[PDB]
Structures are given as structure tokens and as C-alpha cells.
């Protein structure tokens, strides 16, 4: 038993991280087969990042302008091209550690593992959720750009995120691996800010199921409610509406605990209206929304990966 | 910026995990050079685990009784011996992925990364603290025994923990890699339970410094206090006493924020006596004690590992 915020083993991604230096900018790249993927703003300078024309900026670059280092081994760049907000640097060596992978874009509400990196060297790993406002509450310092987010399914690494920038509230914004930003953000210096967020309702319910599975039951109750009457309370507390599909997804959890989904909603209603009255749930004094139904099932059952 | 509970990259440990099967017991082992380390209760059966005599149990075993599988490759056992509560299974192949490593025993208050494993296959990674009562609040299901805890310093993996069992409150107990249990626990079936815990005071202060570094300042105040008057409040709220050495360790954090250590104590005093009044710190509604001063400095500065 136990429930902890848990990331995927990072080893398969660690073997793909490299360092990309261009000019006086250094960041991380992702080396898969004979391509290194990195944020395009590596070609920018300090005055460029005011209103750049990345298309103009890249035509003025050379292959030899890109210093790519895999550990203490230099990689020779033999081609470059831009895909939306990422660069694709073709190198003369396929990464022998290329795992099976896919480039997948995730939905707000979904989680992934972030391998934070500096100078091509992995620093730490942690779990993140894509917020409804397409930001992520990560931990990123100067030099972390190009760190990727990912999920692992058996042996296949689905890359979903590449880090680009920090917004002024301290949250983080980036792209999928095809270079398309999550949310209404751009890789140039503007006054852009996060935008209004909401609580991921289905994840809170999944986490309440994780709690019940792990012996925290004090928030349970005999009440019930309709989906409609629940969604009126959700909208008042800035929670996302709950759909019938969310109820279906919660089915396995409901059946394992014997607590019907709408019963758990009634529990969440009371939690939202009364607070916790000094108690905790899974060691938290807040309702947690960064665990998906899949995350709970995975951890309260025990899946692995080769 | 940002502050998230962050584990070390797990890749170096992933390449050491294997599966050890003996009889109808299967668990994880740690393969370093030509030795596989695993919990000794792999030699036990269901009736054995009532009051075993592991010494008697092992003399009746053969090398061929131990099925060790590294991925889809079998490892041939050529010797076995017991070190306290761990087995040492000598195999005919050195692990070519053996990182530089050390076996280190940690102190309550210190943190480490756990690579949770099932059937020799890594499942997830997360950060844990050794509680004052020598338990860890982990996430462990049937088959996770032999999963290890570790820290990484540049390229060297200091293994500190090997998982053995779950206590009835849902917390976890294990050994250092020399087979010596953390705390007053045994690898046989008794009514043993966790014992009284306390809050790691120095870690809470380090986390309050992480908050200030990240822009949460509402809990700051102009008050101060003596170390003595603080320790009277700590003892009332079941906090560990704060020593002058803890103050010294907090020096770098104090100097970077400009908040003297004893000023932060005065802030913690008020937090303990008044609560948070509906506010949060680093996204928590509780005072967090599972980040060491080193963890905060590492994350609020950005160290990496090759
Ligand atoms: C890339 O390594 C860098 C990562 C951020 C630095 C701090 N935390 C990060 O996530 N990205 C940038 O520096 C971008 N700018 C940016 O994040 O500005 C806000 C900021 C906050 C705190 C410290 C520094 C910066 C880049 C340079 O800017 C564009 C993406 C618009 C080109
Ligand atoms: C080894 O894989 C196993 C891991 C625990 C199972 C559940 N969570 C764990 O951490 N260790 C054991 O099964 C030990 N017993 C034990 O933990 O009993 C309590 C328990 C709680 C919940 C589910 C199952 C068991 C071993 C078998 O017992 C001795 C170490 C005393 C021999």
C-alpha cells in the first residue's frame, strides 16, 4: 500500500539527452536516431528575443554553428531544419540508445514524467499534470530548456512535452515534440501570462478512490447526488464539469471500492462545502488533482515496463 | 523557479535490477559486479515466516534453487551467502552496467530516491525520507521487495535502502545494503509496529526557505526568537529539537534569502500556533518535512549528474 507522486523510470530518456550550444546559448536536446530536437530559440541572442523572425534567423546559420555534445563526445551536425517551434539538427550518428518512441500530444488533465536536465545532463525526475490552462507547475531553472516530458507504455516512450519558458506566475510552458505550443504562448518576449485555471475534477475523484483503497474513509458518507446537482457545485468551486465519460473511466475504481461514482461525488461535494475540518487525505490537507484514473490504477495495482 | 518533489534519474539503478525466484517466492535483486543482493526472506515459505531460523533455511538450499533473470537472460548462480538480512548470490557474470557505487547507511531526516520494481522490472521512481521512527512512507505492493533506495553524487550511486516489508499502519521498513534493518524491525512475522514519530524540524525550515526563494513570503514576520524559546514550542507540537548544527546547515539558505535562521523559526512558531488561515505554502496546506537543506539548495540552484 501507500500512494506517492511517482514518475516513470527515466533511464530510457536519459540515454537521449545531449547538449546543444549555439552562440552563447546552451540548452538540452533530445537525440533520437540521427536527429537532435531542441527549442528553436537556441538560435536567438538577447536582442533577438524581442520580436524575432526565426525564419530569417535560421537561414543565417551554418551546420557548424551548432555544437552538439553527447556526454564527452561531440556530434557532427550535417543538416538543420525548423519544425514549428523546434529545431531538427541532423547528426552523422544514430543514437544507439534510441528506445522505441512516439511523439504524442496530451490533453489537459493528463500527467507525464519530466526529466529535468542541464547541459545535456539529467538532474532529476518528477511527475507533472498539464493544467486546464495548458501550463505545467514544474521546477525549471536557467538552462533547463529542451528537457522533455514523457510517458512509458511497456517499452515505448511517448514523448509529449518539451520545455521552452517560464511564465511570470512561476509556471511553465512548452511544446509537443512537433514544436506546437501547449496553450496560447509564443517563443518570443511578450507580457503573456497563464490565464485562468480550474481544478481537474475527475482526477480529484480518482485520488479520493486511491485514498479509500489505502484506508482513508472518513470523508465517505451515505448521501448521493445526481451528476447535474454535482456539476452545479463544481462550477461554484471552480471545478471542471464532470462528464458521463469521466464516470465511465472511474468505473474500475468504483467497482474495486464498492463506492458508486456519484456517491464519491457527494463526498466531494461535502469536502468542497465544509473543508477537511483539520483532517488529511493521503497525507494532504488539499484536494489533489494531479493523479489521473490511470495513475491510481497503475499504482494501486503495480504495472511495470521493459 | 518552482519546487516539486524530485527524484534522481533512475537509469543507473534500472540497469542493476533483476528478478530472483526461489521456490514460489519472487522478488527483486540488485546486480552489482558478480553479486545479486536481495532480501533473505526469498528462501522462506508461508509456514517458515512464523519464526524462521534463516541459518538452517539456507544450508538446505542449493545454488540451482536460485533462479536469477536479468531481463530475458538467465543468470547462473555459483555461490550464495547471507549478510545479516540480505542474501548475496554470486553469479557467473559481472553486470556490465555496474555504475560506480557505495553502500551507505542514512540518518533519519535524510532523503533518497526509491526505484519501485516488480519482477526485476522498474515500475516508477519517487523521493522518500527516512522518518525519525526509521520507517518510510512509500508505495509498495506484493513483489516490491528488493527495490532499493539511493542517492546519486556526480556519477556515484550511494545505495542506502532495500525494501523488506509493510507495517500495519501502511508504512515501510527495510535494511541498508549490508542487511541491517533501519529501526527495531525484524524479517519475521510479529505484531511489530512503527512506533512514535516526530516532525523533522530542520527540513520544515529548509522548505520554508524554498518557499521564500520561490516568492511565497506571507508567513514571514519581523519577530524573532531564541533557539531555546523555539525548542519549547517545537517540543509542544511534536517537532524535533533544533540544534546549532541545524542552524549552521541552514546558513547558505539564510544568507541567500537574507532571513536569519532564528527569524524563520519565529515564522514557524507562528505557523504552528495559528495554522495557515486558509493559505498555502509551495502548493501545500501542511508544513512539509521531507525536503532536506541539500534538496532545497540542489533544486533552487540546479545540480546534475554524469
Ligand atoms: C530555457 O533554458 C529557459 C528556461 C526558463 C528559465 C527560468 N525557468 C525556465 O523555465 N527559457 C527561457 O529563459 C525563456 N524565457 C523565460 O522563461 O523568461 C521568464 C523567466 C523567468 C525566470 C527566469 C528567467 C526567465 C526564453 C529565453 O524566452 C523565450 C522563450 C521567449 C525566447
Ligand atoms: C515483499 O515483496 C513484500 C512487500 C510488502 C507487501 C505489501 N507491501 C510491502 O511492502 N514483503 C512482505 O510481504 C513481508 N510481509 C509484509 O509486509 O506483511 C504486511 C503486509 C501488508 C500488506 C500486504 C501484504 C503484507 C514479508 C513476506 O514478511 C516478512 C518480511 C516478515 C518475512
Order of helices and strands of chain A: HEEEHEEEEEEEEEEHHHHHH
Largest interface in this structure: A-B, 54 and 54 residues
Second-tier CATH architecture of the largest domain in chain A: Beta Barrel
For the largest beta sheet of chain A, what order do the strands appear in spatially? 5-4-1-2-3-7-6
What is the approximate shape of chain A? elongated
Helix content class of chain A: 10-25%
The DSSP helix count of chain A reads 8
CATH top level of the largest domain in chain A is Mainly Beta
Largest sheet of chain A: 7 strands, antiparallel
Count the domains of chain A: 3
Q: Which molecules are bound besides the chains?
A: the ligand *[C@H](O)[C@H](C[C@@H]1CCNC1=O)NC(=O)[C@@H](NC(=O)OCc1ccccc1)[C@H](C)OC(C)(C)C
PDB class: hydrolase
Keywords: main protease of SARS-CoV-2, hydrolase
Assembly: dimeric
Entry title: MPI54 bound to Mpro of SARS-CoV-2
What does this protein look like?
Helix content of chain A is 22%, strand content 26%. Chain A has 306 residues and is α+β, with helices and mostly antiparallel strands. Chain A has three domains: 1-14 and 100-197, Thrombin, subunit H; 15-99, Beta Barrel (Thrombin, subunit H); 198-301, main proteinase (3clpro) structure, domain 3, CATH 1.10.1840. A seven-stranded antiparallel β-sheet of chain A has the order 5-4-1-2-3-7-6, with no helix packed on it. In chain A, strands 8, 9, 10, 11, 12 and 13 form a six-stranded mixed β-sheet that branches. The complex binds the ligand *[C@H](O)[C@H](C[C@@H]1CCNC1=O)NC(=O)[C@@H](NC(=O)OCc1ccccc1)[C@H](C)OC(C)(C)C (2 copies). The site of one ligand JY0 has 17 residues of chain B, from strand 12. One copy of the ligand *[C@H](O)[C@H](C[C@@H]1CCNC1=O)NC(=O)[C@@H](NC(=O)OCc1ccccc1)[C@H](C)OC(C)(C)C binds next to strand 12 of chain B.
